Amino acid sequence: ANSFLEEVKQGNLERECLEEACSLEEAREVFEDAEQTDEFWSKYKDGDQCEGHPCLNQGHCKDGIGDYTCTCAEGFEGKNCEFSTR
């Protein structure tokens, strides 16, 4: 397959290649992901877990299949930082 890969403008984990950006051709060997090779795959098909904006109140988001993670700022609260204390 010769396309954006011939010159991978840039390969990210599951957050950037969440769409047609990549899937296995470019998102493989681009990261030290040794176990993510499998873990990353097999249990993915979830939008990457960050798709949908699980975090809230200016909360960041650390994906990685096997579920994801979020990040509330200083003055935030709730699972998705929903309760912006400030």
Swiss-Prot record:
Domain EGF-like: 46-82
Protein name in the entry: Factor X light chain
4-carboxyglutamate modification, residue list: E6, E7, E14, E16, E19, E20, E25, E26, E29, E32, E35, E39
Organism the protein comes from: Bos taurus
Chain ranges passing through the membrane: none
Biological classification of the source: Eukaryota, Metazoa, Chordata, Craniata, Vertebrata
Domain Gla intervals: 1-45
Modified residues ((3R)-3-hydroxyaspartate): D63
Cystine connections: C17-C22, C50-C61, C55-C70, C72-C81
